[PDB]
Design a protein around this nucleic acid. Structure first.
Ligand code: ADP
Ligand code: ALF
Ligand code: MG
Length: 436
DNA sequence: TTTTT
């Protein structure tokens, strides 16, 4: 059963007709477990989404993009080219028209344009433009001290800056129309058997520099990444590639390389997986795209069973089933202000065809937000770059003995967004309503 | 840098 404070938030959300709620609290407080209780209460009437594939699977839902069929690009504000309602007889329209509750987990990683598109898509599909989210009761769960939304430095950043003032979900203009009720969780459930670890992460969350010095003196163990049962977390994908290639060297399978087809402008830093992707049987991998048939999803973990020319078999950890993987296509979209109109336009400039597979003995910290891991080693690589990155990497485990780091961390590496300090301040009053 | 399709 749930804890005292989780059940209090359960009743606060289900016993009132208010249409917008946020359940928020530190890492491991039980938000997604409370989400489980909400799914069973609501059962068929609620849709569960999340921004990332790993979080969606952790929430037992799907990604926001794949539910609304949003394209993987900047969703311009109420733009018909970007937010397209489903057809008159489509299965998705029936789902949107009948839906009564939308549950959105890991809302801290939902960018502001994504949240605004969900609002507008629901209003347009349900034919209710006057009501926020088209009259659906939205239940948001997440932590703004965890990872900030991903914002590439194109004209996207300028456009998000001009339209909303920043990238976070609480900067959406829909909060000018409806008040967001905030309910808070405080007790760590993940670190419940290790109360001094839980208190260390609390002080780390407040930015305590003695908690960092305590962490460094206790958790810095360079060889910790080679111990069995250990998931390695890195800030960057290229850093995970070099660590994965080391564990792959030790596998006795005969290797096979999967050669990507690249066309047009598509630079290597933008590749979702290596262009010369080499794999062996038994290798640990994560899948990067959703199956059109529904057998696997972006974020599924599993191991390689068979490797053939343009097809391989993967044994999924999620359900112990065997799925066959084929090449997918990724587009590279860029935005130009050309030339002196008052708008920017997206354009496809390159494509990347490759198996949607990547080795997963080491993952990015982004792909780990939401997970409880048995043992983690943080490889700092060339350093942290994202608000909340460090805190997510440290809060995945239940006990301090389950956590190691490749090097000590200086306090000058801690990042803080002032947008999150005003938000965290105002929502202590139990309410968030956006001004102006 | 990172995510989404
Ligand atoms: N009431 C509870 N009793 C026992 N274990 C719990 C409870 N709530 C959560 N957990 C466990 O604690 C861990 C973290 O909970 P989770 O819901 O994933 O927190 P969050 O979503 O805030 O990170 C998971 O292993 C979960 O199963
Ligand atoms: F939702 Al979390 F750690 F905050 F899984
Ligand atoms: Mg969670």
């Amino acid at each position: 059963g749930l804890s005292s404070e989780q059940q209090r938030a359960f009743l606060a959300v289900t016993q009132t007709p208010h249409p917008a709620h946020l359940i928020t609290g530190p890492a491991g407080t039980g938000k997604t477990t409370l989400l489980y209780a909400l799914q069973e209460f609501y059962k068929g009437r609620a849709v569960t989404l999340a921004p990332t594939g790993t979080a969606a699977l952790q929430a037992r839902g799907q990604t926001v993009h794949s539910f609304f069929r949003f394209p993987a690009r900047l969703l311009r504000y109420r733009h018909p080219e970007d937010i397209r309602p489903p057809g008159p007889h489509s299965p998705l329209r029936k789902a949107i028209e009948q839906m009564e509750v939308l549950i959105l987990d890991e809302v801290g990683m939902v960018r502001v344009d994504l949240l605004e598109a969900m609002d507008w898509a629901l209003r347009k599909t349900r034919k209710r433009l006057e009501e926020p989210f088209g009259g659906v009761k939205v239940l948001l769960l997440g932590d703004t001290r965890q990872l900030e939304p991903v914002v590439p430095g194109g004209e996207e950043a300028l456009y998000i800056a001009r339209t909303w003032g920043g990238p976070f979900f609480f900067q959406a203009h829909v909060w000018e129309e409806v008040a967001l009720r905030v309910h808070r969780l405080w007790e760590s459930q993940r670190q419940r058997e290790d109360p001094l670890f839980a208190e260390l992460l609390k002080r780390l969350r407040q930015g305590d520099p003695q908690a960092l010095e305590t962490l460094n003196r206790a958790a810095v163990r360079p060889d910790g990444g080679e111990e069995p049962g250990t998931l390695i977390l890195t800030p960057r994908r290229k850093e995970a590639d070099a660590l994965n290639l080391k564990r792959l060297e030790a596998l006795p399978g005969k290797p096979l390389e999967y050669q990507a087809q690249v066309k047009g402008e598509f630079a290597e830093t933008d590749f979702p997986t290596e262009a010369a992707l080499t794999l062996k049987k038994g290798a640990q991998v994560i899948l990067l795209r959703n199956d059109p048939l529904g057998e696997y999803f972006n974020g599924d973990l599993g191991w390689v069973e068979d490797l053939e020319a343009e097809a391989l078999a993967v044994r999924l950890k999620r359900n112990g089933r065997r799925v066959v993987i084929r090449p997918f296509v990724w587009e590279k979209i860029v935005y130009t202000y050309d030339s002196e109109r008052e708008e920017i336009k997206p354009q496809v400039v390159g494509t990347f065809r490759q198996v949607p597979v990547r080795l997963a003995w080491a993952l990015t910290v982004h792909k780990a937000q939401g997970l409880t891991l048995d043992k983690v080693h943080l490889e700092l690589g060339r350093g942290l770059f994202a608000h909340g990155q460090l805190y997510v990497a440290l809060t995945r485990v239940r006990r301090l003995q389950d956590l190691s780091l490749s090097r000590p961390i200086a306090p000058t590496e801690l990042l803080w967004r002032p947008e999150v300090e005003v938000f965290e301040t105002r929502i202590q009053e139990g309410i968030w309503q956006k001004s102006h």
